[PDB]
Design a binder for this molecule. Structure first.
Ligand SMILES: Nc1ncnc2c1ncn2[C@@H]1O[C@H](COP(=O)(O)O)[C@@H](O)[C@H]1O
Ligand SMILES: Nc1ncnc2c1ncn2[C@@H]1O[C@H](COP(=O)(O)O)[C@@H](O)[C@H]1O
Lengths: 333, 335
C-alpha cells in the first residue's frame, strides 16, 4: 500500500470546489474557516474556482476537473481538501489525473458528495483517502465544536500514531441547524453515545462514505469492489425514512450484506422520520431481516459536529458490543 | 428464437392493483375512487391488493407485507394485469422476495412507472418477459378529462388492440405538467401544444431498456437490473428533480460506460423541473456530460410523469428516429 506523507505545520492545504459554490454563497464562514487553519499554522492555496458561481455548482465539468488536477500536480501541496459537497463530484471522475496522484501521493480529505472522489481515487490508485473535514462546514464551525473536529484532524493526519489508533467517542455532539454565517446562539450539547445495535466483532478493510453519493458511482471503475470480510461504513444526512430505506435495500439486493463482516452507521443529521418515530438503524434492521451482522450506529463521522477523520481502505477492528473502532494498519508515513 | 409474452388485455379482464411504496389509496381516496371508476366504466374488473386502504406513513406497509400483496396478485390465475397504484421510493425493497417463478409460470402484463421501475426491470431481468412503462392507477387514471382519455387510448392501443408491426408511437397533440386538480378539479389544465425535440440527429435500432433514472440507481449492479448491452436504446425519465440531481444521474451513467454502449437515447419530459436558475433544459445538462460523444437523442418524450402518458414496452426492439422524431416498436410485446 502506497501512503501519503503526514501533514506537518507549515504545509499547504489546497482547496477546491467539486460541487456547490460555497466560497461564493457563504463568504463569512469561508473566511472564518481559512483564518482558523492559518492560525493553527497551515497555508491555504485557493483553487482556481474559488469565488466563482455557476448557480448549483462552481463551474463546468472541465473547469472543476482542471481545478482539482492543478492541486494534484502541485508538488507544494501536501493535502487536498474539498470546500464543501453538493451533488456533482462524480462528474469529475473521468478527467482526474490519477497517475499524477499515484506518483506523488497526497492526503485527500473531505466528506458527503466528495465521497465520489475519495473512493474514486482509492479505487484507481490504491492509496488510502480520508473521510473527514471539508473546509467550510467543518472548520468554519464556531466554538466549541470546531476545536474537537480539529483535534481529530490532527490525530489522524499529523500525530505520529501508536497503533492501534483507538477512535475515541466525543463527549458531546450537535446536528443543530443554526450559526452558519453568523452566530446567533449557542448549540445545545447532546450527550453522546454509540449504539450497540447488533453485538459482535469484525475485522477487515473499511470501505464506504456517504451512501447517497455511493449510488452515484456504483458499478463504475471508480467504486472499489466490496470484498468478503470488508467492514462497511455508511452515513447519510438530511434525508427521510423513505430515502434511506431505498439506499439500505440497494445494498441488500447487491449482496453487500452477504459479504461484509460488520457495519458502522453514522449519525443522521436532521433525519426526517416521516412520523414513524423509527431511527435509521431500525430501518436498516428491517432490511437485514435478522441476519446477524455486528452493527455499531451513531458513529461520529458524518454531517454532525464534531467530526472524526477516518482513513478509508485500511484494516479496522469494530466491536459493536464494546463499541470501539481501531485502525490496525498504517494509513500514512 | 421467440419468447414468452404476456397475453393481451381483453375487456372484462381483472387488473390487480398493489401499493409497492406510497400509501396513496389512504392519502388520496377521491382520486383513487375516481381512477377505479374510470377503468370500471371501460369494462375492466379491479382486484384491490391486501394493502389497499392501509397506512404506514411513508409507505403502505412493511417490506414483507408489500411483497405479500404483490405475490398474491402474481399467483392469481384470474389476474391479467398487475398495476401499481403509485410510486414512491421503496419498490426495490421487495425484489428479493418476489415470486419470479410464479410470474414466469403465468406471465401477466406488468405496468406502472416512476418507483415501480425497480419492479418492472426486476421482473424483466429475472424472467425475460417484457414489462411496461406506463400508467399507474391513481396518478394516470385518476386524472380528470381531457388528458386521462388520451392516456387510456395509448393504454388500449398498446395492450388490447391487435397491432401490425412496425407499430408507430404517435406524438400526443397536447400535454401538461401542471401541479393541480389532484383530489378535486378547480380549473382546467392548460392544453400545451406538444413537440418532441430532435436534440441530436440520427437513427438507432435496438432493444429499449430504461425507466425512471433516479429509481434505476437503487437497483443498479444487482441481479434485478438487466445488463445494458451494445446497441441498446436507453430510455430515461425523471420528475420533480433539480439540475444538480440530474447531472449526478447523467454522470452516473457516463462513468458506468452506458453511453459507450447505447446506440440512441430517448429522454422523457421532466415534470416540474427545477433548473436552479440556470435556465438550462435537462437535455442540455445531459449533453455537457456527453462531452464530445455524439449520440442520436430524442427528448421530451411523453412516457413520464407529465400528462398524457404513453405505454411503452421494455425489452423489445425499437427504432428511434431522432431526426424525424418518430418511435416504432418492431417486435411483439404481447399475444
Ligand atoms: N443555510 C444553512 N444553515 C445551516 N446549515 C447549513 C446551511 N447551508 C449548509 N448547511 C450545512 O452545511 C453542510 C453541507 O453539507 P454537504 O452540502 O452535504 O457537503 C450540512 O451540514 C448542511 O446542513
Ligand atoms: N398533491 C399533489 N398535487 C398534484 N399532483 C400530485 C400530488 N401528489 C402527487 N402528485 C402527482 O403524482 C405523481 C406521483 O408519482 P410518483 O410518486 O413519482 O410515483 C407526482 O409526480 C405528481 O405528478
Amino acid at each position: 500500500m502506497p501512503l501519503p506523507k503526514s501533514l506537518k505545520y507549515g504545509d499547504t492545504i489546497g482547496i477546491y470546489s467539486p460541487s456547490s459554490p460555497v466560497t461564493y454563497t457563504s463568504p463569512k464562514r469561508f473566511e472564518r474557516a481559512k483564518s482558523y487553519l492559518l492560525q493553527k499554522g497551515f497555508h491555504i492555496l485557493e483553487g482556481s474556482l474559488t469565488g466563482r458561481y455557476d448557480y448549483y455548482r462552481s463551474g463546468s465539468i472541465q473547469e472543476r476537473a482542471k481545478e482539482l488536477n492543478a492541486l494534484i500536480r502541485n508538488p507544494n501541496v501536501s493535502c487536498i481538501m474539498s470546500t464543501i459537497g453538493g451533488m456533482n463530484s462524480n462528474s469529475l471522475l473521468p478527467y482526474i489525473d490519477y497517475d499524477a496522484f499515484q506518483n506523488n501521493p497526497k492526503i485527500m480529505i473531505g466528506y458527503a458528495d466528495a465521497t465520489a472522489l475519495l473512493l474514486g481515487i482509492y479505487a484507481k490508485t490504491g492509496i488510502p483517502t480520508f473521510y473527514g473535514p471539508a473546509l467550510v462546514p467543518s472548520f468554519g464551525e464556531f466554538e466549541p465544536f470546531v476545536d474537537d473536529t480539529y483535534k481529530y484532524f490532527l490525530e489522524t493526519l499529523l500525530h505520529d500514531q501508536a497503533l492501534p489508533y483507538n477512535i475515541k467517542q466525543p463527549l458531546f455532539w450537535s446536528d443543530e441547524f443554526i450559526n452558519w454565517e453568523e452566530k446567533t446562539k449557542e448549540k445545545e450539547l447532546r450527550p453522546n453515545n454509540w449504539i450497540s445495535v447488533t453485538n459482535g466483532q469484525a475485522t477487515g478493510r473499511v470501505i464506504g462514505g456517504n451512501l447517497n453519493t455511493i449510488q452515484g458511482i456504483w458499478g463504475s471503475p471508480y467504486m472499489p469492489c466490496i470484498q468478503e470480510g470488508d467492514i462497511l461504513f455508511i452515513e447519510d444526512s438530511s434525508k427521510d425514512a423513505a430515502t434511506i430505506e431505498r439506499s439500505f435495500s440497494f445494498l441488500k439486493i447487491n449482496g453487500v450484506f452477504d459479504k461484509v463482516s460488520g457495519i458502522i452507521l453514522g449519525k443522521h443529521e436532521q433525519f426526517d422520520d416521516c412520523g414513524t418515530n423509527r431511527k435509521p438503524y431500525e430501518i436498516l434492521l428491517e432490511v437485514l431481516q435478522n441476519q446477524r451482522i455486528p452493527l455499531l450506529a451513531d458513529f461520529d463521522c458524518c454531517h454532525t459536529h464534531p467530526m472524526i477523520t477516518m482513513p478509508i481502505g485500511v484494516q479496522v477492528k469494530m466491536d459493536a458490543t464494546n463499541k470501539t473502532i481501531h485502525i490496525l494498519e498504517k494509513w500514512k508515513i
